[PDB]
Amino acid sequence: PFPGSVQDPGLHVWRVEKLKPVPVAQENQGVFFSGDSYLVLHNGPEEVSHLHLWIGQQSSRDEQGACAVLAVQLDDYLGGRPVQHREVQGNESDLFMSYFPRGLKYQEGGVESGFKHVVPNEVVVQRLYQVKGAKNIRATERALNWDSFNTGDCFILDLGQNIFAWCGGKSNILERNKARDLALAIRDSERQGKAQVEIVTDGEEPAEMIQVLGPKPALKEGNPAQAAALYKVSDATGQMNLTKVADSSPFALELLISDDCFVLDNGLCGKIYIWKGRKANEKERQAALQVAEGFISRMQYAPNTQVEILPQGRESPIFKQFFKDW
Ligand SMILES: [Eu+3]
Ligand SMILES: [Eu+3]
């Protein structure tokens, strides 16, 4: 199971991983982890072809055979043609060395190159629920958008470190306490205690409320399938938050911040997009992709759902499933 590019003149080195031959990034060539065996092949545009097998000092007495065998399977995709040489570390071939300018760098133990230290960095999901219930208390997740508030109801805004029980002007005092009670839980249990709560009266919204929702406009009183949902990813707040900016389909374009990444969830019927603003940073990029994951994962979306990344300016005619034709 070789690439089939093995014919192209030049050099090919594969570190025999386990059973599979892995081609060494052109930079990494010249350095051989000594616990593995490698295969290196050099062939001139008219010259012969020598396929040497490099065996590390700490390379298994067997890992060797495995590799030699693989040499064979390859001798054959070229058929008996390549020349075979057994190169042992510490006594390579005056020819083997010919493939390497500066010299060899035998490594040992330690960790694979490009080895990174993945740091699970939690994210704060800012959520807004619209409480409702005379007897029975049920807070429903709404989108964190003023288009969500009404004046005769209470709402809870879980902004992580701080929670708010904003209270409709035309809502009850009873309705108000239910809100505070529920939200008081949210800090007590889910926050395990560390997080501030503050009851808010319509009108008197604190900075933070406006810092997330924006400029408060007028609100409605209250009486009258497209799963698409718009979320935003920004660490602007010195911390990475995920916020569900909208959940009805004709999305208001204003919604989109040139400074953050967004994720347009539509996996239900297809793809999940990730829009990147010019000024959005990479943690935002890194993270918007990772949230696209959690979206297919948690909602158990079709396996083959595609996550098409769209840069600002260069948005796809489909993505424009926002109100006035974008
Ligand atoms: Eu080994
Ligand atoms: Eu930003």
Swiss-Prot record:
Residue span of motif Nuclear localization signal: 129-135
SMART domains: GEL
Ranges that cross the membrane: none
Compartment list: Nucleus; Cytoplasm; Melanosome; Cell projection, Lamellipodium
Matching CDD domains: gelsolin_S1_like, gelsolin_S2_like, gelsolin_S3_like
GO molecular function, one term: protein domain specific binding
Alphabetically ordered keywords of this record: Acetylation, Actin capping, Actin-binding, Cell projection, Cytoplasm, Nucleus, Phosphoprotein, Repeat
Protein name, entry field: Macrophage-capping protein
Organism (species): Homo sapiens
